[PDB]
Amino acid sequence: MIMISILSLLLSTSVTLRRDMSILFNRISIIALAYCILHDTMSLSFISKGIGLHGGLLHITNLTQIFHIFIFIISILILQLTSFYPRKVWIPEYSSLKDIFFNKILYYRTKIINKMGEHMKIIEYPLILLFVISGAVFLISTNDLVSIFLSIELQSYGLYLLSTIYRNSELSTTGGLIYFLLGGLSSCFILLGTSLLYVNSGTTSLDGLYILNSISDVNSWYKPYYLNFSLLIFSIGFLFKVSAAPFHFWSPDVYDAIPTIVTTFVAIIAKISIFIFLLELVYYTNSNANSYLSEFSWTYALLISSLLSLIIGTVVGLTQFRIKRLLAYSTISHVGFILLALSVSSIESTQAFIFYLIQYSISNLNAFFILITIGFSLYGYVTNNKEYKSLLDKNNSPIQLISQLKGYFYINPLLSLSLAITIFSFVGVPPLVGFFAKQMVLSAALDNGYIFLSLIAIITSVIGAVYYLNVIKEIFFYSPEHEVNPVLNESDSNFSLRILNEKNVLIRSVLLKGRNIFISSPFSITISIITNVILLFIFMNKEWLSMGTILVQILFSA
């Protein structure tokens, strides 16, 4: 379905150069990803560790299918930014069902809705995003060494093109260029990792290597040293892409350089797909019996990375004044928690790893939505700060600084509370969902003897809570540097809106001002749902937590 959707969308895209089509090509892509959800939902009625598909090259697991569907929902939610206009005009005279379904509202919307904005004029943008999803989902399903390499490339190359699709931005071309170059270094490590596996073992099957590994677990000419340190090189190439330290340096720069609607999808999807792929590898390569092979486990990179990602993520985030550089360092400290749960391989830690990855991906997406919405709200607001005048590419990243958020609770209080709840959920404060995620990973690590990493993580969090609180301190504790626009609210300049009925006949003409201009519903509803999921998780935790209890039971059974 995703492949039919790419080919069909590409044929329609290839016979048009009309930039007005970008909004409708994005709306059709959301319809396409909804069919993919209906198909992977139908495929969920089997209990199995894995079923080889297509000549052994691909596999399907309950974990593989629940993760494709999650990627599809997340993609539908990110695709909304390019599918609907940011702003809106709302009047009580146009607010009933008969009004919405049988009346029309005519007015000059070109400036109010930013019809000709850059996010609304890239025809191929949904198409390149579908290719990244195609690569992401194929990687979760990869069962061969060759399949892994092609799938990570199909995911990576599209992220390079998305990072560069704003071609008139010197900031995106630079972010795109850094990411392509250093990710190409990352892939050369991944190719070396796979190449050493096939060269020492004669097989491209992951299923064959897991069998060789399980026999070699006993308790003289061909000791299987290659598996642990071929997998080590293979692993470093994936720690670059999830931006786990000490391979993290690119992500603050790239995420800060590319536009914010783009940094939303590029900073979230690669992690879900890569972490799920590594989970099956870590389970099937663990030597239950202590052995010489155990002393050299490739998974110690993951602990070293999780250790480093905790210190690096929270400390370097202390003196970040740029909101996108802050969001990326917050991610490097959260991937440390993810890595720690991935390195302790146990039922409790696999439940914790699965819960943490889904909740952080919805929470980091809320953070991006609030950020994007806050910088679309500043349309009827004006500032006189020299710093806010000296910024670069203000159209692609409307909010670039933490200080730009100073006094936002006095401009829009509920959106500021929504960002407070999301940030407090990154801290790990109860009874929010992020606390429960952090507690589940601490409980698993404490049970399995990783007492030292648990102590690092708790001390690390208080350090990271410092810069999270400086964000909230900026929202709540000072006064706005932004002022209502004096001419958009002047009581002398008002545009005319006119309400017609089902057949091109006028009903009522209205005169409207800037106070009649609001955020479009698709973004306020999306922020509202994720905020309330985060807020009220304690009353709605049973089905979500049980979904992860069962997947772990299937993976560790038999």
């Binding site: 080889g52 069962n143 399980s214 560790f556």
Partner: protein
């Protein structure tokens, strides 16, 4: 579990059909017997469950 069960037990049917030396391929009749037993067992298990529901009607 430390036991790995093949996602793709059909790799036992791989191998080129051309230029085959005589006696090159091993005789994997026991593997086919094992896989037949698993199919018979699962189907037998399944037939003894949908009949209990008929009894519990």
């Amino acid at each position: 579990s430390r036991h790995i069960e093949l996602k793709y037990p059909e790799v036992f049917s791989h191998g080129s059909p051309f230029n085959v030396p005589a006696g090159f391929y091993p005789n994997l009749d026991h593997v086919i017997e094992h896989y037949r037993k698993q199919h018979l067992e699962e189907e037998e298990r399944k037939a003894k469950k949908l009949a209990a529901a008929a009894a519990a009607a």
